[PDB]
Symmetry: C3
Subunit: 563 residues, 3 copies
């Protein structure tokens, strides 16, 4: 005889007695066809009854489901595409799976998670895998603080052996309704435990988090998690795409993201605020959001082959804003930075504050005619802030018809470029025969009224102000200037850049910008003061010529040679 | 009771009537044992009959297969290791799977795809997964335009939630017979749709494409696809390993390749022709093929930790040819460039055209005695073209017994290195007491007849031509020269390189190369003019000594100091 | 009639006679419920029995298991959580799986592997997949030389089509008992085979190797393997975390590691000893172990986004030791280098030997008050060895209260920094009016007694020794010096660093360190001689002032400007 039973209730009611008998369950719920399987009668098992993988019959005899491979939620009575809250059945199935160090599968379908009780995934025991397709976890009615957390139950082993063997979460679209106070995923622990939680090597892959307060938030013990093909979008919090708060314990080692997409925040963004925290992003995209870094110290973010872009957006938000702290480093290596047109880009899209560093390697700096960064900076450049920028292998868009701009003040070719010395030192001021000509430093006379400017008012003959510095091939350059013509009898002058070899031979490839006749502060140089460093150049010379009878103020004479 | 039927045809013939009854199918095809399962009789179902997951019995009653997990092709009557065309059963199973947002599994075996109808995978609905092992999809008799295309049916959501949740293709060896007009995989769409297709985050993994016309071709909407462990080899088209044509719409954001192998093209290659297109290759290998970039503008390719090599090949093909356009950037960061011997490498293996940039970071430049790049360039260097090269952390093979060469013209240490000034300026020509010694610039007199040369024909005493430039530690250097001795009474002279500190102290370790006595254009410097920059060096001085009575032409005096 | 059999023994003993009949096996072992399935009776097949998928009944009739998808070890009688050796059943199941190009699954549980015969996985035919959870393979009683090896049976095809389609090993924790002579995983072949083995694209993922002699060792044909989420810890051999021995054939192309953790060796380490070998590590961590590179030539290791740290360890072991050979390159790009306090870090944590190169890109160099590298080097710097270091985008910890140090001798700003010229050249020695002041080079008089030193003993008025060099913004600097005051009448002097523009204007912010009055060799500069390069600086000047009546030796005047 090979007994078969049509439902879990009927299986449980029968007086099973023969040890080792195999009994078939057709379905967990009568008439559905899911959750069935083979069960072994055991009269001496100590296993806990759970109406799923261990059934205690009414006479006390245990029936042990024969499972090869993962546990499935339907083994505990979960149903696909049901209007009943599925979180209890998933939580019960997960508790069993974790207890036997086996992953839990959720069959592909839609599920509703209601109530307020989170699921804590223990990556040292079991992950939760949507199997396989577009598994939809509707948390729009969930009211708890977090839907999922991921945190090991151990301080060392066997987490050091087991976390890496299977993902913690895979294959799930998890979404809310942007209710204040409900977050999606907590990576680590809410509060500091008495002992550490060993979370290294834990993976979240092929999941989307959407429409939470914070979609993904790092907690304590957030270290060596890896994310592959994770999407985070449309969160409520200003920090809601991905938030790493300050003050985390036992956190920060190589948080890694491969081919993840952080996007369409509609006001939500990424913020890294924890000190001594190292994040690596490989082939990720950051779209219509800002990446803020305000850690007190020792944040290191590396973006290898990533894109930063504003697709379909009119927002002037920054792409990367390193705004506080010291010894914070942000690397952009390869990939792309793309700036679609908007009504006017009135602030720098990259910003690096004092004592911090933004490194650009092997990436092209974009240019667009809508660039208006001078509204923030006082002058036309791509990057703001008093930190440091470095370039290695950076390409400028030298053939862009709208222009090119320098990248940053810290890359200035010329000394006293902004008259910040408080005088005209480092510049040679050649009035020629014009003994009456006026050339004066003026405090608080530049574009913002808080910086110096050089006023040039030649009489009878023009005045030439110049500076020479060492350069060599290979390289490319762009210069911008702020100029304010007060009056002029025609073209007011020109700014020129030329190159010489070490013997004083003038090389081809000199460029020049005419000042014109329009009064008021304006940017000079966009599509003129740019080019490639000639092969054999050893010196670069800038010259500012102002004609007789013109009266011009100059500020922020910013050349960058990327080399 | 518990009814069972031995075939799909027998299941359909029975007059099922009891709503909710579960019925077992032993096998789809009688006697095979595959494709069976449990079916639920459903008297009110609106489901589409398909002889797979929805069966309409002879009396009109629907039976619904109870599926937990992915759909499998054998549920629709597909059979393994059959000579019958399996593409119709796979296409029918895929249409159903996609309609329910569930992936499709193909059981591991060999399959033949015939006919001319492609399968379009919609990554926002379902992927196709060979499960699990070496699944072989023989398309040698397929005559359609493409075997697989991958393109979303949606312009935004739910593609933005679903594409990342599962791969689009996994686990398949897909091959043709190199017939003209049959491509393997189309990434995106053939023609521009009235709305965009949201393809970001779609993955192809663990697949091989072989013996098609173009194995992998990008179409419109090709953006943020990721490829892992994908092999492409032995295509028919000259661009057949991976082709990105010009003019694609809505394409180019972070196309990403992890641990992919592009190889053994037997005349097929990679070509990137689309503008504003960004590709990232991590740990890939490019073997016995060329990577062409001819985008009109704004291509950015980053190769992190990749290998470029010619294993087992006698071909002189280039490894990387950035051949057209402007503002195109190609980065080689880490990894390796390996040049096995061939009968003579008569063109540069890397080429970067005017207005483009090739960045080398942390990689060793190889050298081999079969290098003969001067046949193309006119002079002995590793990289061709009028673009720019940068180096950061590049190692030269300074102990290579065959020699070492400079990398590129744009890294020239000395000014007027190729006599491109049209004169001998930047060089100090010291005739000593030799008042009748001849030293002259000759137009169109170098190796190619298109460049300048310097002729030195001293009388009574030798002539020394020198130049000094700034250098610093750390660094490594290699110089090559082209020399043509017309006549000489013995060794014609010597080229030397030495270093000084800023105070004029000569530092030990200078190097020198004899010119010898052989007539005709020859390369000087291979094993001689190379070394490390001494710690404390601040100047480098080159000197070319030509003896009395010799008559020698010099061209292309190319030194590179890698930092 | 759907016949059913309760065990493999009963299936074999029954007098089957009807050709083509499908019969059901409930379980391989009576009463277990695992390993059952459908079998097709064949009166014509004479296939060789294997008691798993091809079963020969006692009457000679063949019963052919109908399998869809992977082979499972329980189909051959393997049992979970058994005290019997499971290696024979896994090896028999694997041999069959490989023969049909199908992967082998091992159901999640614990297994004991005993005996001494390895399993050689052929990645061109079949992988072994623990499915799905924390699969535990206890090899504590295994006595063979290796547990698993991975090496293809083919020289070209179909390995070029198949290796990438599925992993070779996945999902397994494999552990020993640290018995001498028993290794865990051999990547490739033990000895040089008759033809090459085509191993490219083979993956090991989601596995842990623990407590072997060497946990992971490369053999011949080790090329283009990829490892994802692999852990290696607690090996017996000094090279036991990961060993690449010298002398391998057909090996070294792009061995790739993604998100792997190499850790807690308790005396075991990573060692790369093979020449012409290229390894790429992305988001890996190296914890409480050393990474040794002693390849004779042409090793290239790239670490992208990795961490090197000593968490919880008092050991002074190095992090990276490139100790031999030539033309070896090690890249650290992004990521972090973290140095938790210990009783005194008495050797350099990074070391690069002559003719080799260590490149640092976009990473912060740490500092700690426990740094005592001068005990090894003779002077206070972070990196040892006579090789070369480069920096690009490197951050120094300028706000670290304990100090900052220079990175390496090869980055010396000043010439004759260590008196290695054998004289005082490159330094300006201004005795002022002090005609009797003594300033002299002394051989074998520095900290180690094997290097030069400069002794300054001024009479009546102080002596100032200075040097000037070119610098530019942006940059950061740190200088250390070794000083030995023999006698002094008060503060012995000061070392100062200042900046000028190209016109000789002194820029604000110079720094200085007093020498004090303590006798004996000491480090000067830690928290004093450091800072940012002023924007507009073009020269840096160091000055060493020694007061009248003092008698002081100076050595190792090491400034580094990271530009």
């Amino acid at each position: 005889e090979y007994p078969q039973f049509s439902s879990m209730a009927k299986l449980k009611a029968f007086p099973h007695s023969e040890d080792g008998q195999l009994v078939r369950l057709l379905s967990w719920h009568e008439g559905v066809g899911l959750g069935g399987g083979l069960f072994k009668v055991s009269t001496s098992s100590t296993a806990t009854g759970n109406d799923g993988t261990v059934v205690v019959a009414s006479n006390g005899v245990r029936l042990l489901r024969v499972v090869n491979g993962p546990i499935w939620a339907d083994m505990f009575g979960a149903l696909p595409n049901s209007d009943i809250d599925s979180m209890p059945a998933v939580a019960a199935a997960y508790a069993y799976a974790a207890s036997v160090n086996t992953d839990l599968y959720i069959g592909v379908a839609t599920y509703k998670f209601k109530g307020s009780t989170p699921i804590n995934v223990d990556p040292s025991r079991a992950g939760i895998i949507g199997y396989q397709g577009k598994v939809r976890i509707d948390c729009s009615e969930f009211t708890g603080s977090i839907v999922f957390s991921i945190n090991s139950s151990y301080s060392y082993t066997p987490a050091a052996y087991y976390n890496n063997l299977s993902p913690a979460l895979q294959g799930l679209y998890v979404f809310g309704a942007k209710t204040s106070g409900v977050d999606g995923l907590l990576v680590g622990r809410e509060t500091v435990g008495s002992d550490k939680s060993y979370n290294g090597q834990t993976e979240v892959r092929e999941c989307t988090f959407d429409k939470f307060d914070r979609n993904i938030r790092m907690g304590h013990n957030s270290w060596r998690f890896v994310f592959y093909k994770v999407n985070s979008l449309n969160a409520l919090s200003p920090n809601g795409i991905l938030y790493v708060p300050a003050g985390l314990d036992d956190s920060g080692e190589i948080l890694s993201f491969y081919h993840c997409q952080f996007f369409d925040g509609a006001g939500s963004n990424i913020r890294l605020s924890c000190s001594s925290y190292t994040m690596v992003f490989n082939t990720c995209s950051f779209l219509n959001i800002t990446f803020f870094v305000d850690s007190a110290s020792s944040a290191t973010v590396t973006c290898n082959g990533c894109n930063f872009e504003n697709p379909g957006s009119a927002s002037t938000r920054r792409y990367v804003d390193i705004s506080a702290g010291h010894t914070n480093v942000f690397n952009i290596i390869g990939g792309s930075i793309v700036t679609n047109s908007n009504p006017g880009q009135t602030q720098a899209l990259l910003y690096v504050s004092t004592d911090n560093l933004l490194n650009l390697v092997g990436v092209t700096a974009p240019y667009g005619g809508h660039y208006q960064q001078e509204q923030e900076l006082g002058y036309h450049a791509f990057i703001g802030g008093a930190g440091t920028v470095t370039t290695s292998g950076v390409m400028l868009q030298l053939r862009n018809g709208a222009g090119t701009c320098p990248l940053h003040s810290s890359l200035s070719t010329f000394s006293n470029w902004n008259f910040g010395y408080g005088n005209l030192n480092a510049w040679t001021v050649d009035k020629g025969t014009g003994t009456s000509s006026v050339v004066e430093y003026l405090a608080n006379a530049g574009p913002k009224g808080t910086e110096g400017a050089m006023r040039v008012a030649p009489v009878s003959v023009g005045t030439n102000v110049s500076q020479v510095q060492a350069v060599t091939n290979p390289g490319m350059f762009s210069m911008s200037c702020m100029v304010n013509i007060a009056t002029t009898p025609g073209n007011a002058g020109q700014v020129s850049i030329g190159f010489l070899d070490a013997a004083g031979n003038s090389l081809p490839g000199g460029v020049s910008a005419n000042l014109g006749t329009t009064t008021g502060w304006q940017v000079i140089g966009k599509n003129t003061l740019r080019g490639k460093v000639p092969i054999g150049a050893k010196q670069v010379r800038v010259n500012i010529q102002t004609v007789a009878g013109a009266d011009v103020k100059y500020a922020y004479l910013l050349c960058n040679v990327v080399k």
